[PDB]
């Protein structure tokens, strides 16, 4: 029996009591880039190389939007480990600031 006990129980206490706990910000909800998109989202041939010309991390999308007729025709997305790794690095290496939008 490893990790087989309740540790919270009746736990009402919040950790956001000192103003120094910067909650790690849940990543933005995904907006219109599905396996089957409305094909106006599908990028123009000039911007396909212009997107590849721009340096990484100063880039709006981490991906090329693509159209697929069948669900079987959806490729295994290769740059997926890179995305979680970069998020992991963003948690403990990127400085957290309290901002007013």
């Amino acid at each position: 029996e490893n990790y087989q006990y309740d540790l919270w129980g009746d736990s009402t206490e919040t950790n956001d009591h000192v103003m120094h706990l910067r909650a790690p910000k849940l990543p933005p909800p995904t907006n219109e880039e599905s396996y089957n998109p409305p094909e106006e989202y599908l990028l123009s041939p000039e911007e396909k190389e212009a997107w590849e010309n721009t340096e990484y991390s100063e880039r709006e999308r981490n991906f090329i939007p693509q159209k697929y007729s069948a669900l079987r025709k959806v490729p295994g997305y290769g740059e997926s480990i890179r995305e979680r790794f970069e998020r992991s690095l963003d948690l403990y290496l990127a400085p957290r600031v309290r901002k007013n939008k």
Binding site: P24, K25, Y56, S57, A94, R96, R98, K99, N100, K101
Partner: protein
């Protein structure tokens, strides 16, 4: 002025510089390993 309090991650600097650096470093250690294999076959 009706501002919403929220938290913001600043862009981790030298992300692209180190990215390309690790891209190169990985390939270099591969090639050095291959050179080790050949030179050990000359023993």
């Amino acid at each position: 002025l009706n501002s919403n309090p929220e938290i913001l991650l600043r862009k981790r600097r030298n992300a692209d510089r180190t990215r390309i650096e690790r891209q190169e470093l990985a390939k270099k250690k591969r090639e050095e390993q291959i050179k080790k294999k050949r030179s050990n076959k000359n023993k």
